[PDB]
Enzyme design. Structure first.
Site, PDB file in Angstrom:
ATOM      1  N   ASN A   8       0.782  -1.167   0.096  1.00  0.00           N
ATOM      2  CA  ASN A   8      -0.028  -0.010   0.003  1.00  0.00           C
ATOM      3  C   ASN A   8       0.635   1.284  -0.033  1.00  0.00           C
ATOM      4  O   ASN A   8       1.697   1.591   0.797  1.00  0.00           O
ATOM      5  CB  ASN A   8      -1.009  -0.159   1.138  1.00  0.00           C
ATOM      6  CG  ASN A   8      -1.814   1.300   1.262  1.00  0.00           C
ATOM      7  OD1 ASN A   8      -2.491   1.527   2.121  1.00  0.00           O
ATOM      8  ND2 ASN A   8      -1.861   1.964   0.041  1.00  0.00           N
ATOM      9  N   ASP A 271      -3.978  -1.190  -8.992  1.00  0.00           N
ATOM     10  CA  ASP A 271      -3.888  -0.298  -7.822  1.00  0.00           C
ATOM     11  C   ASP A 271      -3.469  -0.779  -6.483  1.00  0.00           C
ATOM     12  O   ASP A 271      -3.937  -1.536  -5.841  1.00  0.00           O
ATOM     13  CB  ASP A 271      -5.688  -0.077  -7.553  1.00  0.00           C
ATOM     14  CG  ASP A 271      -5.777   0.763  -6.412  1.00  0.00           C
ATOM     15  OD1 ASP A 271      -5.382   0.466  -5.236  1.00  0.00           O
ATOM     16  OD2 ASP A 271      -6.071   1.714  -6.771  1.00  0.00           O
TER      17      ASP A 271
END
Length: 671
Positions: A8, A271
Site C-alpha cells: 500500500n 491499484d
C-alpha cells in the site's frame, strides 16, 4: 491475477506505478538482473533495491514491499515526492542503473530503449547562420492546455517559433537578428515515456494546479510523420503500453496504473496491492478527463503519463522473462535476506504475546517520604518474563523457586490505580482466579506491578506460617508514623484486621509499632490522596465507618498527641502532606544564554505572578520589574509567548504542560 501487486502506498505516490511500468519493461528487467551488486551495501544500494523489488514482483505471491528502496536514495521523507514527479524519478533510477552498467555485458541498455535523437534548430530571416544544437532525450513532456489529442500536442512541440517584439536572436557579429527556434526529430526510441503536463504551476498563488481537461490518446500511435525523414521497413507506429493515472488534486491524491504487460490488449488495473482485470475503455477512454468538480475530488480521474512501444521493436522489448534469467548470486543473496527477516519476525511475534510483571517487596516501602507506599522513580522492582495467557497458578509456581520462598508463605497483592490517581495495593486471591490468564487478570495492563507479601525470616525460621486472609470480613491496612520533630514519615508495616474492628482496638498495635507506651494518646489521619489527609474523628467506631470507602491498601497516618508539636514547622501530619503537594522545584534558565544550566528555586503551586517574580528576583539580586518570564511548553521545549506581568493565575497553571515525571522548568530574561 497472476501478476502480484505492490504494498500500500504511503505517500510513496507514483513510485509504485513507475516500478510496475519498469518491471513489465521486460528487456529492461533482464538487464537489471544482470548487474554486479553482490558486494554492494545491503541497505544503501539502489540497484540491488530494484533487483529485490523486481525479483519479488516476479516470484512472490504476497504484496511486494518497497521499504528498502526508499532508503537507498534519500526520498524516504514523507513529503519529498511532489517536489519532483514521474519524469524525475524515472531519470533518477535509470541514470543510476546506466551508471551502474557501464562496463558490464549489458552496458548501455538504458539508451538503447529510451534514448532518441532530437535536433533544435535556429534559422535567421536575413542572414544564413544556423544553430544545429543536437541533444538526446529519455522523457518527452507534452502540453495539455488547449490540446484535444496526441496528434495536436505533438505538432505544438515541433511548432516553429518566431522572434519579434524585442525578443531577437543574439547572433553576435550580426547583432540581434530575427530568427526561428523550432524543434525537429531524428530518431524515435523503442520505448516512449510521455509525461503530460497536468501539474502546471499557478502563479499566483499558490502554487500548482491540476488541469482536468479532456485529453485523448490512441492505442495505436503513428509517428512517422514527425521525423526529418521517414523510414520504410520500420514505421514509427507505436502501441500503448502503460497508463499512469491520478485522482484528486495537486495537494493530495491517489495513484494507479493501467498496464498492458504482454502487449496483447489484455489490460490490468494495478491499484497498489489489488491487481484486477479491466476493459480497454476502462484503461484508455475513461482516462481522458473532463470532470472538474473540486467538491467531488475523488474521483476526478485522468492520466498524467503514458508509455508507448514501437510495433517493430515490440517482440524484443516485451521478451519472455524466464526464472533462469536471474543469476544465482542474486537469488541466494535475496533468499538469505528474507531468511534473516523471517527469523527476525518470529522473534518479534514473540515480543508480542508476552507481558512482564514487576514484583516489589515491602523493603522498598521503608524510608519513603512521599505519598503512598513508594516513589515511582526510586523503587527497585523484580521483573519477570511471563507468558501473556499463562494461568495464575503457573506464575506463582515460577515465583516460588525464583524468589527462594515457599509457595504457601507468600501472598500476591496487585497494584491498582484508583479513581483519584493513587496506586494502592489491591486484592486478588490465589485459588479464586487460578485458571485465568495473566492478561485478563491484569485487565490489559503491561507492564503489571504486583506487591509481594513475604513472611519475616526472623519468625519463619523460628516457626511462623503466613496467616489466612478472609476477603469477606478482613481488610489489610498500611501504617505510617509521623515525627514532627524530624518532619519525616516512618513506615510501620501493614496489618490484617477484621472490618468490624474498632479503631480503638488498633491503637495498642500502632504504639508498639512505633515504640510507644500503651494507652498513649495518638492522632490518626487517613491518607486518601495527596494533599487530602482526613482525620479520624471518633476512635470507637469500626473501620467501615471511620474510613470513607474502606478498601485493602488504605493508609492510616498516626502521630503522638503532644503540645510540643505546635513548637515546630509542621505540627500535624496533615500539614506535612500540604507542603509536599504545594512545594515544587522550578528551573529558571535564561533565554538569551545558549544552553543555560539554570538554577532551581523552591516555590509554591499557589503563588501568583507577584510572589513568583519577587522570589526569583530575590534569587538573582535584582528588581522584579527587570524580569520577563515566558509561557512554556515542555514537549516543544521552547519558550512560547512572553508572560504578562498582570497574570492573574498561579504557578500551577503555568506548569500544566509539564508531566509530574518531568522536572519543571520556566524560561526568563533580563531587561
Amino acid at each position: 491475477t497472476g501478476y502480484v501487486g505492490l504494498k500500500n502506498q504511503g505517500a510513496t505516490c507514483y513510485m509504485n506505478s513507475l516500478l510496475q511500468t519498469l518491471f513489465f519493461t521486460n528487456q529492461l528487467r533482464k538487464a537489471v538482473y544482470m548487474m554486479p551488486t553482490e558486494g554492494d551495501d545491503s541497505s544503501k544500494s539502489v540497484p540491488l533495491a530494484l533487483q529485490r523489488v523486481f525479483y519479488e514482483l516476479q516470484h512472490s505471491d504476497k504484496p511486494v514491499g518497497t521499504k528498502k528502496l526508499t532508503k537507498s536514495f534519500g526520498w524516504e521523507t514523507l513529503d519529498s515526492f511532489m517536489q519532483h514527479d514521474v519524469q524525475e524519478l524515472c531519470r533518477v533510477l535509470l541514470d543510476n542503473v546506466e551508471n551502474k552498467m557501464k562496463g558490464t555485458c549489458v552496458e548501455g541498455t538504458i539508451p538503447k530503449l529510451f534514448r532518441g535523437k532530437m535536433v533544435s534548430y535556429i534559422q535567421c530571416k536575413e542572414v544564413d547562420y544556423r544553430s544545429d544544437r543536437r541533444e538526446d532525450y529519455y522523457d518527452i513532456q507534452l502540453s495539455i492546455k488547449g490540446k484535444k489529442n496526441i496528434f495536436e500536442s505533438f505538432v505544438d512541440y515541433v511548432a516553429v517559433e518566431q522572434l519579434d517584439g524585442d525578443n531577437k536572436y543574439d547572433a553576435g557579429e550580426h547583432g540581434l537578428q530575427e530568427a526561428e527556434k523550432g524543434v525537429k526529430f531524428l530518431t524515435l526510441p523503442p520505448v516512449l515515456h510521455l509525461q503530460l503536463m497536468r501539474f502546471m504551476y499557478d502563479p499566483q498563488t499558490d502554487q500548482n494546479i491540476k488541469i482536468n481537461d479532456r485529453f485523448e490518446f490512441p492505442e495505436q500511435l503513428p509517428l512517422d510523420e514527425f521525423l526529418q525523414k521517414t523510414d520504410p521497413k520500420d514505421p514509427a507506429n507505436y502501441i500503448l503500453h502503460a497508463v499512469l493515472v491520478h485522482s484528486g488534486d495537486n495537494h493530495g491524491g491517489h495513484y494507479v496504473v493501467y498496464l498492458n504487460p504482454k502487449g496483447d490488449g489484455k489490460w490490468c488495473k494495478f491499484d497498489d496491492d489489488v491487481v484486477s482485470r479491466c476493459t480497454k475503455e476502462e484503461a484508455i477512454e475513461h482516462n481522458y478527463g473532463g470532470h472538474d468538480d473540486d467538491l467531488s475530488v475523488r474521483h476526478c480521474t485522468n492520466a498524467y503519463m503514458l508509455v508507448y512501444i514501437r510495433e517493430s521493436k515490440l517482440s524484443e522489448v516485451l521478451q519472455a522473462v524466464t526464472d533462469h534469467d536471474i543469476p544465482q548470486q542474486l537469488v541466494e543473496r535475496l533468499q538469505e535476506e528474507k531468511r534473516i527477516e523471517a527469523q527476525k519476525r518470529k522473534e518479534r511475534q514473540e515480543a508480542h504475546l508476552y507481558m512482564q510483571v514487576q514484583i516489589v517487596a515491602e523493603d522498598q516501602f521503608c524510608g519513603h517520604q512521599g505519598n503512598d507506599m513508594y516513589d515511582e522513580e526510586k523503587v527497585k522492582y523484580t521483573v519477570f518474563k511471563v507468558l501473556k495467557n499463562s494461568s495464575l497458578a503457573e506464575f506463582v509456581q515460577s515465583l516460588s523457586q525464583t524468589m527462594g520462598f515457599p509457595q504457601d508463605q507468600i501472598r500476591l497483592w496487585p497494584m491498582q490505580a484508583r479513581s483519584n490517581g493513587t496506586k494502592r495495593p489491591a486484592m486478588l486471591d490465589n485459588e479464586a482466579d487460578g485458571n485465568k490468564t495473566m492478561i485478563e487478570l491484569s485487565d490489559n495492563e503491561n507492564p503489571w506491578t504486583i506487591f509481594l507479601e513475604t513472611v519475616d525470616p526472623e519468625l519463619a525460621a523460628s516457626g511462623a506460617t503466613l496467616p489466612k486472609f478472609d476477603k469477606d470480613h478482613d481488610v489489610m491496612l498500611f501504617l505510617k508514623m509521623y515525627d514532627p520533630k524530624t518532619r519525616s514519615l516512618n513506615y510501620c508495616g501493614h496489618i490484617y484486621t477484621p472490618i468490624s474492628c474498632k479503631i480503638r482496638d488498633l491503637l495498642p498495635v500502632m504504639c508498639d509499632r512505633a515504640g510507644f507506651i500503651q494507652d498513649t494518646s495518638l492522632i490518626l489521619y487517613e491518607e486518601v490522596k495527596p494533599n487530602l489527609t482526613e482525620r479520624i474523628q471518633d476512635y470507637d467506631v469500626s473501620l467501615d465507618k471511620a474510613l470513607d470507602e474502606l478498601m485493602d491498601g488504605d493508609i492510616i497516618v498516626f502521630q503522638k498527641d503532644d503540645p510540643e508539636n505546635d513548637n515546630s514547622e509542621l505540627p500535624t501530619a496533615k500539614e506535612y502532606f500540604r507542603d509536599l503537594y504545594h512545594r515544587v522545584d522550578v528551573i529558571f534558565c535564561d533565554k538569551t544564554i545558549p544552553n543555560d544550566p539554570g538554577f532551581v528555586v523552591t516555590l509554591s503551586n499557589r503563588m501568583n505572578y507577584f510572589q513568583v517574580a519577587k522570589t526569583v528576583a530575590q534569587r538573582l539580586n535584582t528588581d522584579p520589574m527587570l524580569l520577563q518570564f515566558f509561557k512554556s511548553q515542555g514537549y516543544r521545549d521552547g519558550p512560547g509567548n512572553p508572560l504578562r506581568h498582570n497574570y492573574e493565575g498561579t504557578l500551577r497553571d503555568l506548569l500544566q504542560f509539564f508531566k509530574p515525571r518531568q522536572p519543571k522548568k520556566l524560561y526568563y530574561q533580563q531587561l
